[PDB]
Design a binder for this molecule. Structure first.
Ligand code: 06J
Length: 208
């Protein structure tokens, strides 16, 4: 297990998201689904030039999996996935610029719900989650687990769990007062409202 410090700007962003009073938390799901959609777009495009990139799985979809016992909501996709370099360095480097712009926009009166316009919507996960675990598998790399409960650091390790083939799993360990997002009716409501035109099948798993 390797432990890393967040870019200073990203740490600041995470603290803002965790500490700011903002009741419209439901937008987190839209942002994560958007991330998945983008990842699916990417593997789909790449497969047009190199069909073998789908040897790791041809189905392009998104699964939403609530678990009341573990108090987790999991967003699963069969998108392009992320390499170790993506997880440790490269996405954070990109996120640095977006974070700065977002935090400046907020100071100018922008709304937290606009986070996606700045390319850092992933971090909206911390509106509802005390810990986020990201399991990911890219064609060119091994299966990794990224994890952070904020506080300025994150970890990355090779994943021992069951193989995914290709794609990403975002596991939200929900805050105690955010369990409404484990309810079928609530998730359906949010998907219908914010994600009705996503171009991939979204399957909401039922509990038990
Ligand atoms: C930015 C950013 C970040 C993450 N994703 C994106 C967003 C930017 C990177 N994204 C654009 C299209 C495909 C790539 C990789 N795919 C994903 C990226 C993100 C989230 C989900 C997925 C996912 N579900 O595949 C996650 C993490 C690296 C842990 C932290 C972070 O800064």
């Amino acid at each position: 297990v390797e432990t890393f410090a967040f870019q200073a700007e990203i740490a600041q962003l995470m603290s803002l998201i965790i500490n700011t009073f903002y009741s419209n938390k439901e937008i987190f799901l839209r942002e994560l689904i958007s991330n998945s959609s983008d990842a699916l777009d990417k593997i789909r495009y790449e497969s047009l030039t190199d069909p073998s990139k789908l040897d790791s799985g041809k189905e392009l979809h998104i699964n939403l999996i609530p678990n009341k016992q573990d108090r987790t909501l999991t967003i699963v996709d069969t998108g392009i996935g992320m390499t170790k370099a993506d997880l440790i360095n490269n996405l954070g480097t990109i996120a640095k610029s977006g974070t700065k712009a977002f935090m400046e926009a907020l100071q100018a009166g922008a709304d937290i719900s606009m986070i996606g316009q700045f390319g850092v919507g992933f971090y909206s996960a911390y509106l509802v989650a005390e810990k986020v675990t990201v399991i990911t598998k890219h064609n060119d790399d091994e299966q990794y687990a990224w994890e952070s409960s904020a506080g300025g650091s994150f970890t990355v390790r090779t994943d021992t769990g069951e193989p995914m083939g290709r794609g990403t799993k975002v596991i939200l360990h929900l805050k105690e007062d955010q369990t409404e997002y484990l309810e079928e009716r609530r998730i359906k409501e949010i998907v219908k409202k914010h994600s009705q035109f996503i171009g991939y099948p979204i399957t909401l798993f039922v509990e038990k």
